[model samples]
Target: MFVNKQFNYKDPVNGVDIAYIKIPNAGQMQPVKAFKIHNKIWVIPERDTFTNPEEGDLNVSYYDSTYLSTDNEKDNYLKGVTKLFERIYSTDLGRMLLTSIVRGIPFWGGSTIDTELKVIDTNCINVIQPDGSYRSEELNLVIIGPSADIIQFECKSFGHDVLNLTRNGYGSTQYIRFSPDFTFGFEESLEVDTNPLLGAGKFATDPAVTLAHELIHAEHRLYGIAINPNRVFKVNTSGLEVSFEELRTFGGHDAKFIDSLQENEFRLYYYNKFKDVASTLNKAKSIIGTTASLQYMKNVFKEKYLLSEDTSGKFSVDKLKFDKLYKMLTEIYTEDNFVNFFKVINRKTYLNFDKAVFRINIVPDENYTIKDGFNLKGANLSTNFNGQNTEINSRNFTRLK
Candidate 1:
């Protein structure tokens, strides 16, 4: 996948390089950097603040919402539209995200030297006319050849095919680039209002969230590639790793919610199965690290917790032992819920979908639990990459490995 490939080239120097790659002869896919706690992960953006326009030489513009209507107030609409264009796209947020895909980088150098900008272009373009021939027409947003270059943007507050047609949609292309004809429009509608749910603040907040989500997708584009520059891709940042699966993964409550919707019975069954591990884990936690007859708990937790099973709890352990096991589980593991620990564990496994599991989670050495499996007689430990001047232990895995 492109995501894995991209991650292969990740380095500290890259900082945060978010790309929307367009492969040759292939469809588009979002890539991201992510890590897993178990096996699954999800890579998608979440949030971000705005970047300055003047600081980066980025340009923005906007158009009126009501100008597209054909009914009352025609001239007033144009005047309103004029002001709308000025107020719509010209903002710190718009400049932060509206960079073209130039060469291998998307928005590199962090400095925009080209500020001369216009969201709309008024010109005749070759459009497929009647009788299977090309004719000149005005359009909006053009895709020239295969380059992932965004030519223009048209900001509107409201839209509809009928409304656009009446207001001279053909001429609207003068404000943006459209291929074939310069006076044509597309199917997608961009209608943002001042309603609390649909305000300028939302536009500012939504794109950053959307872009952040996409960047996470980009991070996953690194895995299994041997090439340098792209090799050693970073799966996550310092802490709180995000992955592709987490975004896609849902838990017990999600299942219940879906089930309530009554779409798929199989999902209910599946959700219940996922719910089981959480319950069983809570039920049998006491037997996890000890040779007690209850040791069956670890095996059950492994299956249900990791597999997202929804089985109910049957076996019971005293509160003390349960607490002990819970402590260990919490140390190297994450849960989905607190009261419903069973569902919690199941939800988490699903959460890890395609993400990378933490190395520490895979092998948690902090708080040791005692069972008869592998005992370290003599152990030497070093927390540093360079083993010099490190704590010594005789039965350490270092000696064995």
Candidate 2:
């Protein structure tokens, strides 16, 4: 869509012989070189040779080695280099997500360099592993167009985003991985059920859903993309794995508590049939075995989702009050609840994340006893670009795509 953008070739040396210095915050940020493309700024860690910025040259500006689409015409240069963030432009949330990151708020680089830095969040970004070891300290963000082309300016950042697929894994121009923080997240593998009770069907954690997740975190800022501090992969410098006692994906219940609220908001906002059912049932979790409560629950369930046939016989027109309602009919899979379930599974790691599932309560029949187990459905989260979210953006995002 952005066709005329081009990297400024004013300084041939800047574009050709790019430079890389451990920019001021290199310990936490990636080491990279900056480039001035047209009126915009870009950074690239890719270089033929790493040229250190001199003491006096620190204040000077530069540009990337590659040329953006030439100003003369737009090529069919489609950006779907493969896929992960493909649905970002398909819905309201997704479009706003692209807009936020691309319209990312600018922050001072905290260095002598005059150029300010921009990214999904600048307050603190921790890229870590399942064991709580650092995959990276902060995201190596690069400015593309509407969305922060989220891959790092560094080669390490590039590989991390595309292949290894770390949580907070990607966002270079080509592809951006959705995060794996698991706080009521989404998936791409068409694995999760959209709504079991309402028979709405299944869907992968698509662009609109994931973008909604990213954007809410962005709201934490005064005016920029903000990371959920509770979910920040806590920096583990032990050079060893972080045990459950040592650290957690969330500090305590706050991450999931906040997540459930976001989930509830988006459940209504973006409208996930499954999440809506989950939250509705979660809110009415007290109505399991009682007669009037069950009727109330049934009314809310069908009315909320517009279902004609009752999915759970236990909640409606059932002869026996199940006598088993005491067994917690359904378990909602928020991060806190999931953590309570999978105590050993790494909460912060994405590798163990795919195992995330929905544990639905099985209501057998009035003649037979319902089993006290969970029928897990696929559910997940992603790592990628977030955007600038303001009160205005939130109001505008209220409209569904």
Candidate 3:
């Protein structure tokens, strides 16, 4: 006689989140009764080869699939985008950087950061604007934290409505595109006061700026995720994209969001550094226009053209918070530090978290004569189970630790 038992992604042994497994199928979806040990999942169907004797014994094998959070449907553009983001957010540095920006957004109000930022591929990216039309592809990124409320967006398009909160924001999705030539970074330049302060990437796009400022207006009033005057874009796909390899970014990772973030946070430092000089420049630009702003900020005086940016009010943001983030970006951590650390394990491990394959398998049927049966054993149950037909074999298991 056999007892009916159910196993899913969540037994202490099957501890992988049930949701992730369900997500891997990607709506067309797919899985089985299995348990996880850390990131590893285990399984045994009673007769694959449990052909033998003994109690407390069984055969097990894991589902080999790495189980991507962003697998299935969508073009290489979408797939590449998903894997890139997953790793960036998964990595410590990238996350902290991104989190710092959102924290400053005012909505979070320095809300404790929880829940890893989840990047997904969905129809949700084609957000309808106030104009009843959508960009169809504007690299939509719908972010929500633990608040997960209906996060509204700032769209100038006449196709949609504007509103507020993360509302299911965690559940919201975003899509992105960039010129394959656009390396979220610059090779080298004297754009800022210093290089170390400059970091790995560069910035110019409003996506990057809006990333930091748009939602900031939210704290000011989030009738949604706030995008500035950048709802319209030039990415007709005639060519714009970021490779997965590019995603494994460093401290200088030219992440567009970070690129723009570079301005909001650190620019405050520059402004405050120059003090009156910066303020006066902003006044000059508004009054003088292109030729005057440039000669004054750049070329002739070479004091740095950015000061010409709107000062009376373009971004009179909370500076203390911006200062805090500035220190984190330039002082506390630099481009060099993260590259060294990530390389150690990164070299040891592999590419793409999607490449980090973890699975589960447990045998419970034929109760083999431990050794005789598990000669095909993936890993010896000997020490772990306190007894064994011990066999230590995990030819294909790639543990993150």
Q: Tens-digit lDDT track for model 2 on 4-111? A: 234332322232222232322234345333332212113432321222222112111122333233422111111211111233333333344344344322221122
lDDT of all predictions: 0.21, 0.25, 0.25
Model 1 ranges off by over 4 Å:
1-208, 211-267, 272-401
Per-residue lDDT of candidate 1, residues 85-190 (tens digit)? 2221233222221111001011101112222111121222332322435333222211111011111221111122332311211112111111110111111112
Model 3 whole-model lDDT (C-alpha atoms): 0.25
Badly placed stretches (over 4 Å) of model 2 are 2-24, 27-78, 81-86, 102-104, 107-256, 259-352, 356-401
Best by TM-score: 2
Q: Candidate 3: deviation at residue 161, Å? A: 25
Error of 3 at 156 (Å): 18
Worst 10 residues of 2 by lDDT: 379-388
Separate clash counts for every candidate: 93, 24, 52
Task: Output the better candidate (2/3) by TM-score.
Answer: 2
Off by over 4 Å in 3: 1-74, 103-126, 129-322, 331-335, 344-401
**lDDT tens readout by residue for model 3, 163-245:** 12222111122211121101111122343543343222222111122222222222212112222222222322365444211
Give the TM-score of each candidate. 0.17, 0.26, 0.24
